[PDB]
Design an enzyme around this catalytic site. Structure first.
Site, PDB file in Angstrom:
ATOM      1  N   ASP B  70      25.012 -58.806 -11.425  1.00  0.00           N
ATOM      2  CA  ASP B  70      26.442 -59.500 -10.208  1.00  0.00           C
ATOM      3  C   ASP B  70      25.205 -59.666  -8.722  1.00  0.00           C
ATOM      4  O   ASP B  70      24.670 -59.438  -8.458  1.00  0.00           O
ATOM      5  CB  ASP B  70      27.231 -58.120  -9.610  1.00  0.00           C
ATOM      6  CG  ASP B  70      28.081 -57.699 -10.667  1.00  0.00           C
ATOM      7  OD1 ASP B  70      28.703 -58.492 -11.342  1.00  0.00           O
ATOM      8  OD2 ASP B  70      27.769 -56.629 -10.447  1.00  0.00           O
ATOM      9  N   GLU B 196      39.830 -61.577  -0.662  1.00  0.00           N
ATOM     10  CA  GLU B 196      39.911 -62.550  -0.941  1.00  0.00           C
ATOM     11  C   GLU B 196      41.218 -63.568  -0.550  1.00  0.00           C
ATOM     12  O   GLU B 196      41.817 -63.547  -1.668  1.00  0.00           O
ATOM     13  CB  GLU B 196      39.702 -62.539  -2.921  1.00  0.00           C
ATOM     14  CG  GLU B 196      38.140 -62.102  -4.158  1.00  0.00           C
ATOM     15  CD  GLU B 196      38.257 -61.595  -4.896  1.00  0.00           C
ATOM     16  OE1 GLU B 196      39.160 -61.642  -5.389  1.00  0.00           O
ATOM     17  OE2 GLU B 196      37.212 -62.454  -5.504  1.00  0.00           O
ATOM     18  N   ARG B 211      44.258 -59.731  -2.389  1.00  0.00           N
ATOM     19  CA  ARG B 211      44.096 -59.109  -3.109  1.00  0.00           C
ATOM     20  C   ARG B 211      43.923 -57.500  -2.512  1.00  0.00           C
ATOM     21  O   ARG B 211      43.360 -57.516  -1.702  1.00  0.00           O
ATOM     22  CB  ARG B 211      43.281 -59.872  -3.948  1.00  0.00           C
ATOM     23  CG  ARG B 211      42.904 -58.223  -4.471  1.00  0.00           C
ATOM     24  CD  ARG B 211      41.378 -58.722  -5.847  1.00  0.00           C
ATOM     25  NE  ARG B 211      40.725 -57.628  -6.598  1.00  0.00           N
ATOM     26  CZ  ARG B 211      39.543 -58.882  -7.279  1.00  0.00           C
ATOM     27  NH1 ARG B 211      38.877 -59.651  -7.258  1.00  0.00           N
ATOM     28  NH2 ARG B 211      39.197 -57.696  -8.504  1.00  0.00           N
ATOM     29  N   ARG B 290      43.446 -60.960 -17.557  1.00  0.00           N
ATOM     30  CA  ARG B 290      43.795 -61.990 -17.052  1.00  0.00           C
ATOM     31  C   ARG B 290      43.856 -63.595 -18.306  1.00  0.00           C
ATOM     32  O   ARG B 290      43.112 -63.679 -18.565  1.00  0.00           O
ATOM     33  CB  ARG B 290      42.405 -62.567 -16.023  1.00  0.00           C
ATOM     34  CG  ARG B 290      42.138 -61.145 -15.141  1.00  0.00           C
ATOM     35  CD  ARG B 290      40.757 -62.077 -14.407  1.00  0.00           C
ATOM     36  NE  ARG B 290      40.807 -60.676 -13.317  1.00  0.00           N
ATOM     37  CZ  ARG B 290      39.478 -60.794 -12.286  1.00  0.00           C
ATOM     38  NH1 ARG B 290      38.512 -61.283 -12.743  1.00  0.00           N
ATOM     39  NH2 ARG B 290      39.949 -59.600 -11.405  1.00  0.00           N
TER      40      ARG B 290
HETATM   41  C1  LIG Z   1      35.689 -60.876  -8.510  1.00  0.00           C
HETATM   42  C2  LIG Z   1      37.199 -60.620 -10.184  1.00  0.00           C
HETATM   43  O1  LIG Z   1      37.255 -59.700  -9.871  1.00  0.00           O
HETATM   44  O2  LIG Z   1      36.776 -61.313 -10.918  1.00  0.00           O
HETATM   45  O3  LIG Z   1      35.627 -59.692  -7.806  1.00  0.00           O
HETATM   46  C3  LIG Z   1      34.977 -59.773  -6.926  1.00  0.00           C
HETATM   47  C4  LIG Z   1      35.036 -57.884  -6.608  1.00  0.00           C
HETATM   48  O4  LIG Z   1      34.098 -57.429  -6.510  1.00  0.00           O
HETATM   49  C5  LIG Z   1      36.265 -57.293  -5.741  1.00  0.00           C
HETATM   50  O5  LIG Z   1      36.929 -58.263  -4.969  1.00  0.00           O
HETATM   51  C6  LIG Z   1      36.080 -55.865  -5.242  1.00  0.00           C
HETATM   52  O6  LIG Z   1      35.115 -55.690  -4.309  1.00  0.00           O
HETATM   53  C7  LIG Z   1      33.537 -60.203  -6.615  1.00  0.00           C
HETATM   54  N1  LIG Z   1      33.362 -60.600  -5.526  1.00  0.00           N
HETATM   55  C8  LIG Z   1      32.073 -59.954  -5.098  1.00  0.00           C
HETATM   56  C9  LIG Z   1      31.386 -60.268  -3.418  1.00  0.00           C
HETATM   57  O7  LIG Z   1      31.520 -59.597  -6.328  1.00  0.00           O
HETATM   58  C10 LIG Z   1      34.010 -61.709  -8.075  1.00  0.00           C
HETATM   59  O8  LIG Z   1      33.019 -62.381  -7.641  1.00  0.00           O
HETATM   60  C11 LIG Z   1      34.992 -61.900  -8.606  1.00  0.00           C
HETATM   61  F1  LIG Z   1      33.575 -60.911  -9.683  1.00  0.00           F
END
Ligand SMILES: *[C@]1(C(=O)O)O[C@@H]([C@H](O)[C@H](O)CO)[C@H](NC(C)=O)[C@@H](O)[C@H]1F
Ligand SMILES: *[C@@H]1O[C@H](CO)[C@@H](O[C@@H]2O[C@H](CO)[C@@H](O[C@@H]3O[C@H](CO)[C@@H](O)[C@H](O[C@H]4O[C@H](CO)[C@@H](O)[C@H](O)[C@@H]4O)[C@@H]3O)[C@H](O)[C@H]2NC(C)=O)[C@H](O)[C@H]1NC(C)=O
Ligand SMILES: *[C@@H]1O[C@H](CO)[C@@H](O[C@@H]2O[C@H](CO)[C@@H](O[C@@H]3O[C@H](CO)[C@@H](O)[C@H](O[C@H]4O[C@H](CO)[C@@H](O)[C@H](O)[C@@H]4O)[C@@H]3O)[C@H](O)[C@H]2NC(C)=O)[C@H](O)[C@H]1NC(C)=O
Ligand SMILES: *[C@@H]1O[C@H](CO)[C@@H](O[C@@H]2O[C@H](CO)[C@@H](O[C@@H]3O[C@H](CO)[C@@H](O)[C@H](O[C@H]4O[C@H](CO)[C@@H](O)[C@H](O)[C@@H]4O)[C@@H]3O)[C@H](O)[C@H]2NC(C)=O)[C@H](O)[C@H]1NC(C)=O
Ligand SMILES: *[C@@H]1O[C@H](CO)[C@@H](O[C@@H]2O[C@H](CO)[C@@H](O[C@@H]3O[C@H](CO)[C@@H](O)[C@H](O[C@H]4O[C@H](CO)[C@@H](O)[C@H](O)[C@@H]4O)[C@@H]3O)[C@H](O)[C@H]2NC(C)=O)[C@H](O)[C@H]1NC(C)=O
Ligand SMILES: *[C@@H]1O[C@H](CO)[C@@H](O[C@@H]2O[C@H](CO)[C@@H](O)[C@H](O)[C@H]2NC(C)=O)[C@H](O)[C@H]1NC(C)=O
Ligand SMILES: *[C@@H]1O[C@H](CO)[C@@H](O[C@@H]2O[C@H](CO)[C@@H](O)[C@H](O)[C@H]2NC(C)=O)[C@H](O)[C@H]1NC(C)=O
Ligand SMILES: *[C@@H]1O[C@H](CO)[C@@H](O[C@@H]2O[C@H](CO)[C@@H](O)[C@H](O)[C@H]2NC(C)=O)[C@H](O)[C@H]1NC(C)=O
Ligand SMILES: *[C@@H]1O[C@H](CO)[C@@H](O[C@@H]2O[C@H](CO)[C@@H](O)[C@H](O)[C@H]2NC(C)=O)[C@H](O)[C@H]1NC(C)=O
Ligand SMILES: *[C@]1(C(=O)O)O[C@@H]([C@H](O)[C@H](O)CO)[C@H](NC(C)=O)[C@@H](O)[C@H]1F
Ligand SMILES: *[C@]1(C(=O)O)O[C@@H]([C@H](O)[C@H](O)CO)[C@H](NC(C)=O)[C@@H](O)[C@H]1F
Ligand SMILES: *[C@]1(C(=O)O)O[C@@H]([C@H](O)[C@H](O)CO)[C@H](NC(C)=O)[C@@H](O)[C@H]1F
Ligand SMILES: [Ca+2]
Ligand SMILES: [Ca+2]
Ligand SMILES: [Ca+2]
Ligand SMILES: [Ca+2]
Lengths: 388, 388, 388, 388
Positions: B70, B196, B211, B290
């Site tokens: 990540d 988001e 979200r 999804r």
């Molecule tokens: C999206 C995803 O679910 O596909 O998740 C984001 C976060 O993990 C989620 O909103 C929980 O806080 C990721 N964002 C970050 C900054 O890691 C997205 O990249 C994406 F992964």
């Protein structure tokens, strides 16, 4: 369009924020990407460009073993918008195994050196045409900044050296108008060896922090008067010295005037800049290897000999990862001139012998007056995934 | 050039028409194409651009297995004209594992977040230069929209969150002029978790549908007052809820004010927009994964709690195919402001374990006042043809 | 910039001179190049562009076997400067398995059709934004020109058909202003089946030579009145007919009014244009296969029913080589409007079964008032060198 | 924008400085690069472009064996910014197995010849459109300069030959305004065979140094009067002659008027230019093969028959490396017109039989009034690393 004057105060910064990364070596494992070294960044009034010296080949290419030779005639200066990696559509701006570039507000100047070690030629290209050239004056690797030159009111200045890499050499400062050399001043002052200057506008003049490859692990300073072409030079005051190799912080010294004679031979291109009595500087984390990269402010680092109080340290590249050359560039804001820097991240030989080639990617940071956190942004390629 | 004000009424639409598709994954099986995720679209007054977060590698490249990690420091924001796939000549605009971009009518603003999870840095780049930065305020993955920010009269706004992904977090709304943060407002109102946001101009203000990753499968709403920086928030009224996971249509609920506590944890970036009392929205077809993507209008979906009467449904991606994040963008027409959306089409892990990588392509639709038919526009790659 | 009016006389030509060739298939054997078909050319007031419908894949790519299916959702309209082959940096302008494009002097219009056979959607994109759309009116493959539309004084016209490919269908002529459909006229006159019109400005109106896929091997003509939106239609008078298949020249007929019922079913997109009583036209050299390509002038070919006197023949592609669709485009000169044409050179299936894919390259010629020689400019790829 | 007049004096040079190198063949071993030959350089008032004749294929491609054939219909004129190697995004400007290009200050003219040996067509393309064409007048390989044409006050001139390569041929000088041939003058004077002229502005006229493929190893001169279209011709006076093959320096001769009948048959495209009574010229270092490249000034080389005193020699390519065609281009400076040249560096057949293909890279130098050193800048590829 008007000539740049850089006549704004320097931005008052709290440290640096991430600006750009090109991921060149990672991409080279799955795409055709130039082999490079000695990168830098320079910006026209609208946007920034990344430069580097190609090795006349892509990485996944048998010709990549060519980086075992120095200064080959196939090296050319590459120029892309910052963040566009060096792919096969990259323009080769001139023939060069040493270079400097800058924009005067109207057009780009490129200083490109190539040819025989004992009899090199520097070409001066402005606004897309060759305007001047000069031959080697000391017959021993005519060479220049490997970062941006600086222009004020249509006069661009660049620092060039010819002569020994391990003893007294012949350094000269050129003043160039629309590609035409109008004056050349010899180095003056107390700096005893000058290579690879990282220069920035400090209106009404230009200031450079360079590399002393002979006797000093403290970095030399060159001040350029753009009004009368006079030159002065000295050494960065900071007792936390910027060159590699260097002594440990507990036993390093600078008196602001002379090379310190502490692991003085050899070195690496680097940068620093003054802010009143204080100094912002970067350096490798390792004292003897081009590993890691850190920045910090030295309190009294500009004005106080041997000052060793630092604050606002940031890790740019952790010490488990390779760095390389680094240099400064300046960007004009609405009300102030900001200072930024790039770090060359060298992969391959001599440190990583699984492959035959040597290349690099870059990471780029810019001064900020805001806040920031921590991280590490190394090259990121897995040497075991690379074509050899 | 003049600042955008978005001061036209919203286009009265009958549904959406196909606008763009990039075919990234299909092309990756026969060419060098970036590994990406979290794409979005934003347009300057002349044309549209596609953005995504790169993973510092192409797909046919051993480094593509890096997506198992990540937020690597090698993620960068990519920007091409819409429909130009992310090939090796793509510009990496900044370093970013979370981002937002928008054009204020004069220049592009990019909000780029990178660095350590517990101490990230957001950089603000405007008109090609770094203007500001802010550090993490809650030490837990500072993060932002992953779609376009919105600017009115030279002030751009963007929603950022720092803190838990599964509990109360710290959301703030930034107001930015030419790259400079001029004001920060905390989230206010009844939305209990914000991630988001998909934001759009609704002159004189900005509206975002977001979200809730903690307790709601109904989507939170954030309303931004650009005149006094005040903030309000609530939840989309529609009983046909937009998040994934969620309850089936017969058992889903929203009261417009509180998270519904129906399969509330987890979620996916999405969008909706109001038209009078009605709501246009998209969502995955599957209520648990999804998979698929559909759009429709909910009668009374904006004003009436738990409204479930839909009309004008369109399948964008059939339920036999993978989708992903989706978001809104707005496009100024002669007399009205149109709303468009993109859908991220995720291929590879975790759903398709034959390969190690995860990447995406996109499909893009725009509002229309005309007529249209049916289809399905999925990613289209054969997983068995891909490099692993 | 001002709207085009095309209000100059037609150039008086002696034949055609070579203009452009893209060598797509040859290049596909050593580089990543899009799989395409249905190419065309159109020019803005300054320069020309090549268009084609991609198949969502490159040729050296396992996804290239996808061309066995018709009208897949992954087809997109590609647009490059003329002579730039369809490499991975090519912009996909819209989603389309049938298309038409034209520049009104101010901006580009693209008409893009995609979706289900029985319920397709045509999108109208002007100046970089979606402005209108229309759904299928006969529920049987809504389809359009596959060559340039034509604009006069800001009104662009395009011919579209929906319905049977082998019987009476529903053809309509759309008038479009800045992307907005302002009027739709039904086909009128004696043409009984219309597909794939090749249209050109004939101030104050527009003239089209099309393909009758039902009963005629003579080509239908459609005349469009831009002032009152009225439509007329008939058939090219020439007894040397332009469609493939067709009868031998000794037994072919046209009466200018009705389809000739000579090998009338099926056909190929083609072109012709009037010059007073005479006709310039191109056609395949083979009477039954898409092999070869020739142009010539028919004396009385516009005005005299069944005229068969030709002069000024040129071979464009010899009969040992494959051709395909062909179409007209117009280019404004200093004092006259010139007519040019492209020829699609189809390689792969169904004729060449060594490979699984079908793709094309193009060759392009323009009218000249000077002199010229002879040659043949086929695709040139060796089928045995291609990836299968 | 205004027509170029080239009405400045010629720059007074001391020799030449390195300007550009493209490294094409080295790159071809690790990337998709066009197979080319007959390159040249020409600049618009802002920047320079490199041109070459493609062979319709990349090098790492089985179609690269096609270079064994002469003048294939797949040859096209390629045009990139100088230093951008011929990658797959390169625009093919027209169909051409012989060409010339120049910019008149407002737009580009391209002269493109293709088709059958006995009946070729020259197309004239100006400002992006076909304006004129002419057919073969002697039915024996109509052909032109393979370097830049020259324009004064909106009239461009180009030298073309049709007829025997080894005997008297039919050479004509065309005068072209905005793509339109307005006048054609036959060759006049004492030059007995003319091919591949390297022409430059010498206000108020145009001067060309050419290749005599029949009886002279001295280079013919063609003088073009732009005011009355009159033509004169002769031979370069210098006893150090410029063609290959030729006699050694101790036994070579020229009388300024007649071909010298010294190893006169065969030849290579080359260049020279006058400066008062003196001559600057380049030639291969080898007197028998296209090996090496050198430049020098001959004192009295323009005015004195058989003059052999040289000065200011520079090695461009050492004699251990292959060269090829070379030609001149002119670049306007602030106060004078500079002369530059390119050298084609041919690799592959017939000299290197390990591979089937023939291709080239280029190196480019520009006149300088400054100083310079020495070097050698050959192609640099390892033939053993190449795809065959
Ligand atoms: C999206 C995803 O679910 O596909 O998740 C984001 C976060 O993990 C989620 O909103 C929980 O806080 C990721 N964002 C970050 C900054 O890691 C997205 O990249 C994406 F992964
Ligand atoms: C989140 O990020 C912020 C911003 O990066 C970070 O705050 C910074 O921490 C560093 C380390 O503490 C500070 O820099 C130090 O300043 C002190 C003087 O106050 C110096 O003594 C330090 O130098 C010594 O220690 C270094 C190792 O830390 C040695 O390498 C060096 O040789 C010296 O012995 C050092 O310069 C910096 O000032 C702050 N920045 C700001 C603006 O506050 C913070 O720690 C991060 N938080 C977490 C939990 O990660
Ligand atoms: C050709 O294309 C047109 C345009 O796409 C298409 O017309 C559309 O059909 C759909 C489906 O019938 C309509 O949307 C529906 O509207 C009704 C209200 O009248 C809703 O009840 C529907 O929702 C229910 O059913 C859905 C499945 O269809 C479920 O998924 C949902 O959960 C509900 O149970 C649905 O929203 C739409 O309004 C029209 N659009 C227009 C503009 O007329 C047409 O059907 C296609 N032709 C053919 C032959 O199919
Ligand atoms: C060098 O190139 C020139 C220009 O291309 C070329 O001249 C052209 O020759 C052709 C063939 O003779 C001419 O076209 C013919 O015109 C006559 C009428 O005068 C027609 O009868 C011909 O059609 C019949 O023959 C065709 C085969 O040639 C059949 O396909 C057709 O069905 C008919 O039976 C044909 O149209 C053309 O007019 C000239 N062009 C000009 C401008 O003069 C010349 O022949 C070439 N020279 C050499 C030696 O190759
Ligand atoms: C560093 O570089 C400089 C600049 O390139 C270089 O100076 C140049 O040297 C050459 C060679 O001596 C000079 O050119 C010569 O000029 C004399 C006239 O004085 C001619 O006689 C020479 O021609 C003869 O010799 C050639 C071989 O050198 C033969 O190939 C030829 O057929 C003749 O027999 C030749 O033209 C040139 O003038 C200077 N240039 C300048 C500007 O001074 C210098 O030599 C290099 N330094 C070192 C240490 O070599
Ligand atoms: C690239 O160059 C290196 C030398 O710099 C070549 O490696 C050498 O190969 C020879 C024989 O294969 C060995 O004897 C040497 O030990 C190698 N040198 C080193 C330092 O490793 C390499 O072979 C070249 N690449 C290719 C494809 O030939
Ligand atoms: C890319 O990374 C994955 C792991 O993330 C590697 O896959 C592992 O490979 C090892 C040895 O082959 C196995 O023991 C593990 O079970 C694998 N892990 C998973 C999760 O599959 C993969 O090898 C990497 N790519 C390359 C070329 O090394
Ligand atoms: C691409 O598609 C074709 C089918 O359109 C595949 O070819 C078939 O392969 C199967 C089994 O290999 C054979 O039984 C059929 O006879 C083939 N069909 C035809 C018409 O040749 C082909 O395998 C596909 N490509 C790949 C890589 O799977
Ligand atoms: C490219 O063309 C050359 C001929 O121009 C081919 O080389 C010939 O190959 C055949 C069979 O292998 C030999 O009998 C000939 O002696 C070869 N000719 C020459 C002059 O070498 C070559 O095979 C072609 N490329 C490919 C892949 O087919
Ligand atoms: C750097 C380097 O150390 O990594 O060294 C330069 C010089 O060797 C050094 O400064 C001593 O003079 C190289 N420059 C030239 C012109 O060779 C750099 O390329 C670089 F190699
Ligand atoms: C051409 C072709 O024959 O080669 O046919 C078109 C139609 O099938 C034909 O005109 C009958 O209606 C195809 N168009 C569409 C929309 O399918 C062309 O793509 C092309 F295939
Ligand atoms: C050069 C060459 O020798 O290398 O020759 C040209 C002619 O063959 C020669 O000038 C004799 O007439 C070729 N030109 C053409 C039109 O074939 C060049 O391409 C080149 F081959
Ligand atoms: Ca040192
Ligand atoms: Ca949720
Ligand atoms: Ca027919
Ligand atoms: Ca000769």
């Amino acid at each position: 369009v008007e000539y740049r004057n850089w006549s704004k105060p320097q931005c008052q910064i709290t440290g640096f924020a991430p600006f750009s990364k090109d991921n060149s070596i990672r991409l080279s494992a799955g795409g055709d990407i130039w082999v490079t070294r000695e990168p830098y960044v320079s910006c026209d009034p609208g946007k920034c460009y990344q430069f580097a010296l190609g090795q006349g080949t892509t990485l996944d290419n048998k010709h990549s073993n060519d980086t075992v030779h120095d200064r080959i005639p196939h090296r050319t200066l590459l120029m892309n918008e910052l963040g566009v990696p060096f792919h096969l559509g990259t323009r080769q701006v001139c023939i060069a195994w040493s270079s400097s570039s800058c924009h005067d507000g109207k057009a780009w100047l490129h200083v490109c050196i190539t040819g025989d070690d004992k009899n090199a030629t520097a070409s001066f290209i402005y606004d897309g045409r060759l305007v001047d050239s000069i031959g080697s004056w000391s017959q021993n690797i005519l060479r220049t900044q490997e970062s941006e030159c600086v222009c004020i009111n249509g006069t661009c200045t660049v620092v060039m050296t010819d002569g020994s890499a391990s003893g007294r050499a012949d350094t000269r400062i050129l003043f160039i108008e629309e590609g035409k050399i109008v004056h050349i001043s010899p180095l003056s002052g107390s700096a005893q060896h000058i290579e690879e200057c990282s220069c920035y506008p400090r209106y009404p003049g230009v200031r450079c922090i360079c590399r002393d490859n002979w006797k000093g692990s403290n970095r030399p300073v060159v001040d350029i008067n753009m009004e009368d072409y006079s030159i002065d030079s000295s050494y960065v005051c900071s007792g936390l010295v910027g060159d590699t190799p260097r002594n440990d912080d507990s036993s390093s010294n600078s008196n602001c005037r002379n090379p310190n004679n502490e692991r003085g031979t050899q070195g690496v291109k680097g940068w620093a800049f003054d802010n009143g009595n204080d100094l912002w500087m970067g350096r490798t984390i390792s004292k003897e290897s081009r590993s890691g990269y850190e920045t910090f402010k030295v309190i009294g680092g500009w004005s106080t000999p041997n000052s060793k109080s630092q604050v606002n340290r940031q890790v740019i590249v952790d010490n488990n990862n390779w760095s390389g050359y680094s240099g400064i560039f300046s960007v004009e804001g609405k009300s102030c001139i900001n200072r930024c820097f790039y770090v060359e991240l060298i992969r391959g030989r001599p440190q990583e012998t699984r492959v035959w080639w040597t290349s690099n990617s870059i990471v780029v940071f810019c001064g900020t007056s805001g806040t920031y956190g921590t991280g590490s942004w190394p090259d990121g390629a897995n040497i075991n995934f690379m074509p050899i």
